[PDB]
Amino acid sequence: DGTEKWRFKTGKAIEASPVIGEDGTIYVGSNDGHLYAINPDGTEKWRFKTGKAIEASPVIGEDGTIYVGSNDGHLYAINPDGTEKWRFKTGKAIEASPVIGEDGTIYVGSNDGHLYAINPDGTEKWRFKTGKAIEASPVIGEDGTIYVGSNDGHLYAINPDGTEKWRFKTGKAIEASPVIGEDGTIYVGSNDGHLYAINPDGTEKWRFKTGKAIEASPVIGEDGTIYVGSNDGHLYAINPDGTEKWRFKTGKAIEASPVIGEDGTIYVGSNDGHLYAINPDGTEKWRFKTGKAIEASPVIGEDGTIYVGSNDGHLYAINPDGTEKWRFKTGKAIEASPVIGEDGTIYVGSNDGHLYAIN
Helix, strand or coil: CCCCEEEECCCCCCCCCCEECCCCCCEEEEEEEEEEEECCCCCCEEEECCCCCCCEEEEEEEEEEEECCCCCCCCEEEEECCCCEEEECCCCCCCCCEEECCCEEEECCCCCCEEEEEECCEEEEEEEECCCCCCCCCCCCCCCCCCEECCCCCEEEEEECEEEEEECCCCCCCCCCECCCCCCEEEECCCCEEEEEEEECCEEEEECCCCCCCCCEEEEEECCCCCEEEECEEEEECCCCEEEEEEEECCCCCCCCCCEEECCCCEEEEECCCCEEEEECCCEEEEEEEECCCCCEEEEECCCCCEEEEECCCCEEHHHHCCCEEEEECCCCCCCCCCCCCCCEEECCCCCCCEECCC
């Protein structure tokens, strides 16, 4: 209903979305360097200290282990009771969340340029060198291939044994994770402005040009359309053959991935401050104005409500017809997408340092 259930103070901005465990514990990292475990009633279950800001969401393993990277260069494995299971050193900040494979191997990139594969027990299975920082999470395909983009401009396909399957060159840094279609095509945007479709064997299927960097991952619709925002301000809908189905203009860069509602409507925030709802045919269904850039993807609740945070400090709940359900004020920009619990509580961190639980 938009009323505050509780808030929880950390010392510094919360940059990434919280994550909810099976028992309802809410886990969130802070720029104060700690991983917090918060009980559903808003009291601290425990905290865990790292040396520098935690930039990305924690990830929970099937056994309840919570993994989190830090700007201090380590990947931490934390037991459900908040004690350290192990910590794994890389040379530089770990910017993105790790991902866990079917055999338990934990993969994560570092600003030291390497993709690390870490065994469940914390020993190194292998590392794979790229030239420059790895800014986004790796993605595991159906045969266990690990795909990761690098600031060296290449998308790498790594075999489970750590050997290179292939690498695909783009001209500029790849900032977001790739996305694999049902037929195995790998889609990835680049700061060179193009969306690339890469065949399973590493050859280019096609490329689609936008004017400016593509900051966020593409999203594939049920009929195979590939949607991607660009810093040129447009949302593009690309057919599986690489031709443009349509483009939709916003005034400013689109920094986050779009999301598709149950009826096919495509929702995207823009740095022009609006949340746009776009019909499958490319026409505007409506737009909703916030005061400042919307930096993260909208989230759709079970009843169709669209939630979005803004740099104006508010969390907005928007009805499917584009009218405001409510808004909720925090003191500073909300950088990451909110997360909805099973009872409908909406959780979101703010640059004011607090994690908010909103009814």
